[PDB]
Design a binder for these strands. Structure first.
Lengths: 110, 80, 177, 55
RNA sequence: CCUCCUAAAGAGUAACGGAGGAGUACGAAGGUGCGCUCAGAACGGUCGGAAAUCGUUCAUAGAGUAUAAAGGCAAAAGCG
RNA sequence: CUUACGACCAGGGCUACACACGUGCUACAAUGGUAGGUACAGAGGGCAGCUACACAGCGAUGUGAUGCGAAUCUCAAAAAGCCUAUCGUAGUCCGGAUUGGAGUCUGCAACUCGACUCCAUGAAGUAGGAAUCGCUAGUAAUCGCGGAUCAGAAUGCCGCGGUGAAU
């Protein structure tokens, strides 16, 4: 089945497949499936197309993956062009969250 | 960051300086030592001079700065 | 060929009225649609060409043709007369049908697409667009896909000027800029 | 159009459930399930999204 | 042995004079019939750039002619 | 050394990393992960206070209300474990680094620089080079629970008990 512009593998449960979609998580998928008749146990292949359409409408209510990616990029760019200490941190590839970086500083550069 | 019920933290002397500057819309920098004070919508547009530890650096309060503390725009460590 | 039927009846007259052209014959039209898939990897491993031909044939609906490189570059390490790219040419009734299928399905499935830049036109009335991913078209099947490859589409219009070219596309409804 | 050297090409009906729109066009894709259409019976491929519904 | 200059506007013309190649290759790279036109510059376009392939506008050859140079080459002698 | 090498105060710093380094923690998964149920302790702390119970909240926590200076009330629920559903060798329903967003608390103040809460994002890592270390019995490994400094700030340190080997 295709949700939100990308493909989800059909071999496992609906909630687990929704987890794969960017911007979608397991708890959010459970919340989505609770409202509508679809149950988390049922597989995507088993699940009917009309159910999938209602699911797409529920996902559409939530902010989509492209929109989320663009907002994150926009926020980082806003910090950079503001030039705040946080923007300087983003530009210089150093932890902006305040985490201690004396020795294990590896996981910012890549 | 700060409990919403307590409201923003805004130091009294910078508060007084900024209201006495708002009634004039003066452009001369407000030289201040308190970098812990909340930037409010009222002080959008004018210029402060925030202590960075060694000297004061000007900070022209832009629109996209409310929600940040004064010291965020005054780096303290200078690393090349 | 719903678009072919529609263009003669409706779109042509409204294009003429909108541009205030003196003569009906002046009104522009889409002469041809060309699809290009150049890949450097091909002709060295030699496995890329078969899949590229398969996907291009499936999407286009016509048999594509393999171009032969006319120049050799040391940096790209391409010798003379190697099959590095594949292209196809669509016109007329079949072009209008391909364009209808494209407008119908190809662009909407594209992920993270808001619109096409207005500067894409070269200034002579011709239009060029690039598709990031071939999977977007419905003809291809995601299950048995070896790899993802992007595509280039070119639209040729009689009008020599970009304003009339854009109006011709607008009458057809090509997604807003 | 040279004979016999081209792909299989035939009539197809593309429908969007959300937009409730029917489109008729000839495509090489083949569909296991077909919907009856008053003009004639040709195969059915479902569409998740359609251009008209697309913002 | 071949090309250019020396060589003095027909040919020819020397120096231990100034400059470069040859001692091959092709059953197609020959014949015929048909068809085609290059190098570059700019603009647009996924990876893809200075430059790969695709589209457009100029472009008598600024290309190509198996090979050194001279001449010649559009009925192309160039390319299928 | 004595209008300074003495005395006070605001701001910052002790928390900066191209890289090296010793201690540990969490992993790389099926002897498992996640969901439901369901048991079995120990010792320790509590007016510079722990809160039974009601309601608001997905949550940390909030407003009431009550017992207890505690063999009374309370932190407190023990976890590994046992029964079922599922994931089926996949960088995965492994892993939770990192970042964006929202927030609750302590504190006069959380920018440099607090620990937690939910949502999303989901990096390396699929067992480790020469070399190297601890451990002989309720010991190694494994599991959580306490206390001290403490206004708030543990994987550390100081204790505790469950499971429980091989040689």
């Amino acid at each position: 089945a295709r949700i939100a512009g990308v493909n989800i593998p059909d071999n496992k449960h609906a909630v687990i497949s929704l987890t794969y979609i960017f911007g979608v998580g397991r708890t959010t998928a459970q919340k989505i499936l609770e409202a509508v008749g679809i149950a988390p146990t049922t597989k995507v292949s088993q699940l009917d197309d009309i159910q999938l359409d209602a699911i797409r409408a529920q996902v559409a209510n939530y902010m989509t993956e492209g929109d989320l990616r663009r907002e994150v990029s926009m926020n980082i760019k806003r910090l950079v062009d503001l030039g705040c200490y946080r923007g300087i941190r983003h530009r210089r590839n150093l932890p902006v969250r305040g985490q201690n970086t004396k020795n294990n500083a590896r996981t910012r550069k890549g | 960051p700060r409990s919403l019920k307590k409201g923003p933290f805004i130091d009294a002397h910078l508060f007084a300086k900024v209201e006495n500057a708002l009634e004039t819309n003066s452009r001369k920098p407000i030289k201040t030592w308190s970098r812990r004070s909340m930037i409010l919508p009222q002080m959008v547009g004018l210029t402060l001079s925030v202590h960075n530890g060694r000297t004061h650096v000007p900070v022209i309060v832009s629109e996209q700065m409310v929600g940040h503390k004064l010291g965020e725009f005054a780096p303290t460590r200078t690393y090349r | 060929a719903r678009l072919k039927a529609l263009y003669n009846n409706e779109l042509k007259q409204k294009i003429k009225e909108e541009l205030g052209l003196d003569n009906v014959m002046q009104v522009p039209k889409i002469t041809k649609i060309t699809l290009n898939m150049g890949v450097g990897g091909a002709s060295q491993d030699k496995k890329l060409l078969e899949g590229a031909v398969a996907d291009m044939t499936a999407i286009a609906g016509q048999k594509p043709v393999v171009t032969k490189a006319r120049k050799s570059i040391a940096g790209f390490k391409i010798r003379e007369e190697w099959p590095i790219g594949c292209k196809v040419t669509l016109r007329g009734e079949q072009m209008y049908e391909f364009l209808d299928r494209l407008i119908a399905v190809a662009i909407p499935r594209v992920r993270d697409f808001r619109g096409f830049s207005p500067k894409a036109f070269d200034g002579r009335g011709n239009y060029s667009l690039g598709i990031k991913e071939q999977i977007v078209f419905p003809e291809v099947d995601f299950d048995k896909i070896d790899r993802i490859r992007g595509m280039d589409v070119t639209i040729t219009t009689s009008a020599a000027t970009d304003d009339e070219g854009r109006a011709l596309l607008k009458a057809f409804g090509f997604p807003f800029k | 159009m040279r004979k016999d050297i081209h792909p299989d090409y035939h009539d197809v009906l593309f429908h969007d459930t959300n937009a409730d729109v029917f489109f008729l066009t000839r495509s090489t894709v083949k569909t296991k399930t077909t919907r009856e259409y008053e003009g004639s019976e040709y195969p059915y491929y479902p569409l998740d999204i359609s251009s008209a519904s697309h913002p």
